[PDB]
Amino acid sequence: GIFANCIFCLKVKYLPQQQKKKLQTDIKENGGKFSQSLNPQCTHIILDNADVLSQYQLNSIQKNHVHIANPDFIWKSIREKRLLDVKNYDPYKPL
Numbered sequence: 001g002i003f004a005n006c007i008f009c010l011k012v013k014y015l016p017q018q019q020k021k022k023l024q025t026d027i028k029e030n031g032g033k034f035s036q037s038l039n040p041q042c043t044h045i046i047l048d049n050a051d052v053l054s055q056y057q058l059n060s061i062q063k064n065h066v067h068i069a070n071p072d073f074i075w076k077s078i079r080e081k082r083l084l085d086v087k088n089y090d091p092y093k094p095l
Contacts, residue, residue: 001031002083009035009042012071014050023071026078040064046071047091058092068092 008027012020023046027034035042038057044067047053053061053068061068073089088095 001029002077002081003027003030003032006031006043007033007035007041009038009045009066011051011053012046012048015048015071019071023074026074030078038066042066044069044073044086046074049091053092 006027010020010023012023015023024034038045038060040060040063042064045053045061046069048071060066067086068091069086069089070091073084073086076089077084
């Protein structure tokens with residue numbers, strides 16, 4: 001699946017529960033893994049709009065080369081049936 005070898009930390013506390021679960025099932029059904037809390041094994045952290053990261057979290061992210069993405073990264077990669085450019089979906093560095 002398109003998310004093989006990807007490990008996602010989900011910070012999507014403010015999404016409707018239905019959307020959170022669809023995010024999870026979309027990830028799991030397409031080869032992806034989950035990490036409850038942020039750790040060095042994470043390749044990705046998904047952040048909804050209302051969620052923020054601390055300086056400590058941002059430092060860990062930089063150190064461990066974690067990709068910060070919004071839920072659209074998942075939705076649109078699924079929709080296009082192809083892993084998209086995660087750099088186009090970074091809330092902490094919009095383009």
